[PDB]
Every structure is written in C-alpha cells, then in structure tokens.
Paper text:
Laccases, also classified as benzenediol/oxygen oxidoreductases with an Enzyme Commission (EC) number of 1.10.3.2, are multi-copper oxidases having 4 copper atoms arranged with oxygen at its center. The 4 copper atoms are termed Cu T1 (where the reducing substrate binds) and trinuclear copper cluster T2/T3. In this work, we present the crystal structure of a [name]-laccase enzyme derived from Bacillus licheniformis ATCC 9945a (referred to in this paper as Bli-Lacc) adding to the growing database of [name]-laccases.
As expected, the most highly conserved residues are those in the vicinity of the bound metals and/or those in the core of the protein. To further validate and confirm the resemblance of the Bli-Lacc against other laccases with solved crystal structures, a multiple sequence alignment using the amino acid sequences was executed and motifs characteristic of laccases were found conserved—HXHG, HXH, HXXHXH, and HCHXXXHXXXXM/L/F as can be seen in Figure 5.
Author numbering:
A (entry chain A), B (entry chain B): 2 to 89, 97 to 358, 362 to 512
The structure:
C-alpha cells in the first residue's frame, strides 16, 4: 500500500515572530486541529498541529537571543485518539527538548492547559514562555508534553523544529541555505480513511481490560519525513547538511545509504563534535538528533535511497519500513560548492564528581495485567528522589534489566556518555546486586559529544556524567518512548540551590 | 603473599639463527624442562619452555625472509600438569599464531611429536618448518598446539614472541630499540612449592567424574608480564612502543593506566592501522595483540601502574589481579626523543564475496555431565565442513548463544570485523532461526585493522569477512580459550584449489 517516492520532501517554513526588539523576540504559536494530505494517494489526515501545519513551523534563534513564545491552545474539547482514562480532554503543554530553559518555561507535564487556558494543570503558572538561549549552537525540537497523553499529542502531529546558531558554527563554512535540509523522520499507520490509526487496546484485549488501554509499544508501518510519506528530493551533486531527528513514539532507526556513500557526522543532541566522524550507519533512537554532512559530488545522475536496516523489534526491516526517502541527484549544480567539511569543529572542550546515582529500568504489572514501565521501580506520583544540587557534577548509572533498549532523556542539561557494561540479570532480580559480567565499552565515536538522550542497551549499565546547571527548580527525566513515558517511566528532577544550609 | 612490583621487567632475548644465507635463515629451538624463578619470593617453578627460558626467545624476521625453524622436543616422558585421558604423554607441535604459513608448517594439532620424534601424530610430515613471511609487518607469537593438551603445554610455559618487520613500518619513525617493549601478559596460580597450580578436576567432582578432568575455564590469581609476577620497569620520560599480547588460557583483560595517560593504538593482530586511535582502555582477549604508543614525556618522576579493570567472569577486578605491572618514570632522558607518532600509518587499504557461512557457538553435555563447548554443535572428530575455495572472499556469521565472550580465531588468514548484532536467544534454541533483536554495531575504532582473533559477544552475531589465500590445504579454526579448544571448540578448515572442474 502507498507507492513510495511520489511526493516531494517538504521543508517546514521558518516561523516569523510577531515582534522583535533588542530586548526580546516574541512569538505566538497556536495549536489547531486541521486536515493535511500526507501522501499523494491518501485522503487528508486529521491532525493536531502548531500553526495548522505538520510538522510545526521551524524556529531560527541565536545564542543569547531572549526568545518569548506564547503557546496558545485552540484544540477541541475531545481527542480523536484513544485516551486511556485509567493511567493518571485535550491537555497541552509545550516542551523545548534539549533547551537550557528555566523550569517555569520548560513545559512541565502537569503544567498543561486546555483551550484558551480555561482549565489549567496543578503546576500551571505562565502563558508566555521565555527561552534565554544561553547554550551553544545545536538542533533542538519542540513537542507536546501533557501528562498521560504525551504519546497521543505528539503522534497527533504536535512536533516542530528549533535551531540555535553560534558564531562558532557559522565560522565553519558548512552547507547552508537550501543545502541544509532537516530530516524529521517519523513512523505512522493510516486507515483507509486517511486518518491516523492508534490502537485502543493491546492485541487480544481481555474483557475487564480498560477501554481504551495504553499499549507498551507502538510503531507504524509507514515512514514519514517532514510530514510526507516516503518522500523524494532532487539534489545537486555537492555537499549537503542533514539535520536528522527521530520523532517517532518508539521506533529506533538504523539509517544507511544504498550506495557507497558515507555520513560525516559533525554534531549530536547538544551541539558540534570536536572533529567529523565518518560513519556508515546511524542508529537514532526517539528524540536523538544527528548533524551529518553528505557528499553527492561523485553521484550526479544516481538515485540514492536513504534506507533503514531494522524493524520495530530490531529484526530485519521489511522492504517497506526499510525505506526512509529517496534522493535523486538530478538538479544541475547551480554555483560551485564552496562549503566546507573542516577537520576541527569546536576547539573548546566539552570535574570533582559530587554525587553517584544508581537508577534501574524495569517494569511491574498493574491490576489489569498491563506492564507498568518504571524508573527505580517508582511511580510518577511518588516523592522526588533525583535531587542534584545546583552546579553539582554527577555520574548516573542507568541499569537496564529489560529486554530492549530504553532511550533515557534528561531535561535541562546536556551530558556525556561514559561507557556501557553488561551485568548479571539473574543476580539483579533476586538480590538487587549489580555484578558485572563483561568489559566496559565506550560509546561509539559519533556519540562522544553532548547529548540529552542515550540508548541504554538491554542487560547493560549505561553511565553518563552531568552537571546540573545553571537553573534550579523542578524538571523531569524519563524514557523517550512515549508509550513508556506515559505509563509510567517518568520521574521528577529537582535541582536545588544551596545557600544557607 | 607475593609483594607486587619487586622484580624488574624481563625482556626476552632475540633469537640468533644457527645459519643465515641469501636463500634461507635456519633456526633450531628445543623444548626443555627446567626451573625458573618467577617472583622474588617464590621458589623456582618447573616449566616447559623453548630453549630453556620462559617466555621463549623472540624471533626478528623480515618480510620476504624465508625463515626455517626445526622445533625439537626434549621434554620428559611425563607431563607435570594433570592430563585428561578421556577427552580425545607429552605431545608437542609449534604453531606460529597469525603467520601466513603453508599447512605443512602451520602446526596442525595432530601433527604432534614426542621427544626426538619418537612417536609422531597421524598428520606428521616434517621436522623443519618453513615460514615464507610474505605478509606485512605485525606482532605474531608461537606456542604449542598439540591436540587435547594445548591448554597444558601453553600453560606450562611454551609461548614466545615473533615479530615481522616492513619497509613501511620502518619508514614510520616509531619508538625502537629499548623504547619498544613487548608486554606478554599472562595469569597463573602457584603452590607454596613455587610450582604451577592447575586443577585436576572441577570444584565439586562426583566419583563418576574422570580423574583428572578438564575444566571449562581456568584463570590464575597472579598476573605475569614477560614471565615475571607483577613486575616493574624504570623508564625515561618519552614515547614508548608497547607490543601487548594476551597469552592467558582464558582471562580477558581490560587494561588502563591509573594516571590520565592515553593509549595511542597503531596496530592490531594483522599489522598497522591506517591512523592512530586514542583509546583509554584496551580490551584484550587471549591471543589478541595491540600495538600501542604511550607518551610518558609529561610523567617525569611519576609512578604509572598498568591496571586491569575486570576479573575472571567480567566482574570488578580484585585489587590484586587489577594490577598488571608498574612503570616508574625515573630513568633520566638519555637522548632527545626523536621518535614519531605519525598521523598516517598504512596509506594502502586493507571483493566479490562468494560464500556465506553461519557458525554457532554452544555447548553440550557428555556422559559425565561435563560441558562440551562446540563449533556448529560438531565435534572435532567429525568430517570437515568449513571448506572455502582458494582465493574466495567469505562473510562468516559467528552466532554466540553462550553466556560469555568467545575469542574465535582463524588460521592462515587475517580478517576484518564487519559488525556485531544481538539476536533472540530463546528463539534460537527452539527452531534454530536467527531473529535479530537490535541494531547492528561496528567494531570499536581500534579493532578495525587486520585481525585473526575476534571477541564474539554473548547473545550476538559477529560478522567477519576473510579472503582465504594464498595457500591451500588443511588448517583449523577455534576459540582461543584453551580450556574450550581442547574440549572441544576446534574444527578443521580446508582451503581447496580449483582449476579443472
Ligand atoms: Cu522530547
Ligand atoms: Cu526534554
Ligand atoms: Cu522505555
Ligand atoms: Cu521530557
Ligand atoms: Cu594461537
Ligand atoms: Cu593460530
Ligand atoms: Cu570459547
Ligand atoms: Cu590455533
């Protein structure tokens, strides 16, 4: 179903502010319900989107630029996706993923609000968010974060891009303009209606199981890029810059080109790497970003398809979800490609270690027999335990006793991945003891940079180092598989300033 | 007991040939029983060694140098280590690990011989081996390979070094002379006698168990380097070249320095890399080699200890086997360090791909209840199945359904590690179908060179690609955990020439 590579790759328009001064740059974005055609042969798709478009408008901000956004809710009173009323209306709150944001503008899950702020969550306090943008140039993105329905609102189309620029990044003569292309890759499933399909219950729903019921994992049979089903793009035989983002609910990608063409990765979630990394395949979990350079100069006239290697459970991808999009190197070379792939990308490096933390990834069963994925076997309602001090540098040991990868995400900060190491699963479930069973392995070279989301392998412990700065207050950390996050792999993160005790 | 860092680090003497001409360089090495003091506070240890020294003499050969060695057996009638007479006297045959050697001089396990060639194995042919040395510069090593008792003869002390030199390697101004130090690392256990300890049976043997009985794994409590228990070495504050080798029976090391000093790996088992790789920790399984450069120039007066992170089952090392040796940067800098750490090492890179092979790692139980580790669930007695054609390129998929790492080693060839990928263990032990459960991962950057031994992770499939050239005939491939190789993880490898039908 759905013929591949018939629609052209859409580029989200750069959002224009309502007012821009030397003090502040003020934006207004509204969440509206609408229809949008996602494939040449599909009927329009009912979606929740920012400024009536999917994906939302793209923010272009600068370092130090004080940006203010008023996120307006104009969505209906009822959701068009199956809402599980038993895990915790259309509630909305906007979170800038990876943004160095004070807690009052970070998009707390319980700071949600309905249309026109008429019904507010218990943590609501502001209608106009402010982003100081005191972080280095990188690729961020914004999406909904309302509690218990984050999997639905994000899947409904509430995602958008957000770029930060530096004088350091611009000093690098990188492919810019039309030669910098963002790839917001997502997976979805459609009815014959053309509308989104999201399961109401697991496969064989028992009678007394709640209806609707949250599923432990969802992944669609159709791959989209920038809101277009298996699109295509006509490029020039030169160097391009791809800002790749995986905004799926669950699906992990393993991207590769069907020709002998290599990705040159120059940046991660947090910003630029120190030197480019020559990689043939990109393993990108949900919410992970990859800043890559691709050279098509030796490929004039060829048809290069961006491919995916793995399915939803890590198996070999079917030659339907094995396709991302198709590049056709047929556009004539306008000007000479004078863009650069410099050997050095940063110069500047990325302490005392004040705190150590052990955090377990697991699951429990509720009264209906559903798996409840948990952080430290602790529900979201429970009191806060991850309480780092303002300015503290900590090493988090993330212990994955599950069957598959968990992409764990921390708010506010950008961390570094230390190493992965396997441990004894049986000893861990019977004793709580962490006995290692193999040598430690550093992260891949293209994951040595600043990141806010890390793939924690199954049966292994992932160590990250993080400096909780420069804002104190209430944040959260969670797994970015939204089906896990909503029930209930999410926990509060309280950064505390110390002054007089 | 055994105080650490009280004996100086021995350097094995280079072996002098008996006769050297334009045609051939002829050597003679004898295996003799002798006693050698391995620690300052240990009585001399009974050993089997080449030329009455442990480790054996070091060969220094050239590329294209036709080297001939006549390995002579002068060993006693009785082996001092416990011999299992149920798995398949002092039988000996010398194998040049990693050498591009014709089969008649490769050291086939059943080409063994007793003292003065009295009794000869069923595959014996010649007394003088010839090594054409038509391969690039690398660090090899020679050790005993007699069938059913390879774990005993190697543990008895029948190991030695063998270096090949190139004009390419020499063109690199690498640290040479006394500033190139080989680190032959091993582990052993000692009786109060000072003699070697090696278990006769597993821990709790039923009376139905044979006596002696092979164990699935042995690792000693004491770490040796170049035949000296926890030695030390006084170095100058400059760059050194370490040719590290793991010659243990089973133990896998994770080497690191207790100071902020980085390994710059320049070569692997098969020879030089293309570019140096900055690594903080070296994971070296048995038979693996690591050519690394260490810069001590900023450590004048410091005491730098080479440490080991992991133990026998991959757990955290005990602060006794966590120590390898101690480097004391106290020798004054003689001459100015003019050696080079060049950014380019090889220039020239490392085909059609004719054959694909799936090879499983597992274990069965014999009549006595002992685990029998097997390749393709097939005994060594059984007919040969790995029959590549001369000059053909193959991709071997090594499927490890076991609990721990298996260092799989192939003879004759040097291969390139493609990737690792997890699979479903439970589905694999039911219908034998291979279902992957995660993304593929390329090898670490410092394991991208030519290799002849690869760490196959548990629950993962390690893909290797090899070209079987230029000698046809009978070789073997096996796991280099000697307790596994002897019972019975060793299978024949037949390279067949084709020319007429
Ligand atoms: Cu996010
Ligand atoms: Cu976030
Ligand atoms: Cu998860
Ligand atoms: Cu979040
Ligand atoms: Cu060997
Ligand atoms: Cu070998
Ligand atoms: Cu093994
Ligand atoms: Cu061998």
């Amino acid at each position: 179903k759905l013929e591949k590579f018939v629609d052209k790759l859409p580029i989200p328009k750069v959002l224009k502010p309502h007012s821009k001064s030397k003090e502040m740059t003020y934006y207004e974005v509204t969440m509206k319900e609408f229809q949008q055609q996602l494939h040449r042969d599909l009927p329009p798709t009912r979606l929740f989107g920012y400024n009536g478009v999917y994906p939302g408008p793209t923010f272009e901000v600068q370092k130090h630029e004080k940006v203010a956004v008023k996120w307006l809710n104009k969505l209906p009173d009822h959701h068009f996706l199956p809402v599980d009323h038993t895990i915790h209306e259309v509630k909305t709150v906007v979170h800038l993923h990876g943004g160095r944001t004070p807690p009052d503008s970070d998009g707390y899950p319980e700071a949600w609000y309905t249309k026109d702020f008429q019904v507010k969550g218990p943590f609501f306090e502001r209608e106009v968010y402010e982003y100081p943008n005191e972080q280095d140039a990188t690729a961020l993105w914004y999406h909904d974060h309302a509690m218990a329905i984050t999997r639905l609102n994000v899947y409904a189309g509430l995602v958008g891009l957000y770029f930060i620029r530096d004088r350091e990044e611009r000093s690098l003569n990188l492919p810019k303009g039309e030669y910098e292309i963002p790839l917001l890759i997502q997976d979805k499933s459609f009815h014959e209606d053309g509308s989104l399909f999201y399961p109401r219950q697991p496969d064989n729903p028992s009678p007394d199981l709640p209806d609707p019921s949250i599923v432990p994992a969802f992944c669609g049979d159709t791959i989209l890029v920038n809101g277009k089903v298996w699109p295509y793009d006509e490029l020039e035989p030169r160097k391009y810059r791809f800002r790749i983002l995986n905004a799926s609910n669950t699906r992990i990608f393993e991207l590769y080109f069907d020709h002998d063409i290599t990705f040159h990765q120059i940046g991660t979630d947090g910003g630029l790497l120190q030197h480019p990394v020559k990689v043939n395949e990109l393993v990108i979990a949900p919410a992970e970003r990859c800043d890559i350079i691709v050279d098509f100069s030796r490929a004039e006239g060829k048809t290069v398809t961006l491919k995916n290697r793995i399915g939803c459970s890590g198996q070999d991808a079917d030659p339907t979800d094995a396709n991302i999009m198709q590049f056709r190197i047929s556009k004539p070379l306008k000007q000479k490609d004078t863009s650069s792939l410099p050997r050095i990308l940063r110069k500047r490096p990325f302490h005392k270690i004040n705190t150590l933390r052990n955090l377990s990834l697991g699951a429990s069963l509720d009264q209906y027999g559903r798996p409840v994925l948990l952080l430290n076997n602790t529900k979201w309602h429970e009191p806060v335990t991850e309480t780092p001090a303002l300015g503290s540098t900590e090493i988090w040991s993330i212990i994955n006793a599950g069957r598959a990868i968990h992409p764990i995400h921390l708010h506010l900060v950008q961390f570094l991945i230390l190493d992965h190491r396997p441990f004894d699963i049986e000893r861990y479930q019977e004793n709580g003891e962490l006995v290692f069973t193999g040598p430690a392995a550093p992260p891949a070279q293209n994951e040595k940079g600043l990141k806010d989301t890390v793939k924690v392998p199954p049966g292994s412990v992932t160590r990250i180092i993080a400096t909780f700065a420069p804002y104190s207050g209430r944040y959260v950390w969670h797994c970015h598989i939204l089906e896990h996050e909503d029930y209930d792999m999410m926990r509060p993160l309280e950064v505390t300033d110390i002054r007089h005790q």
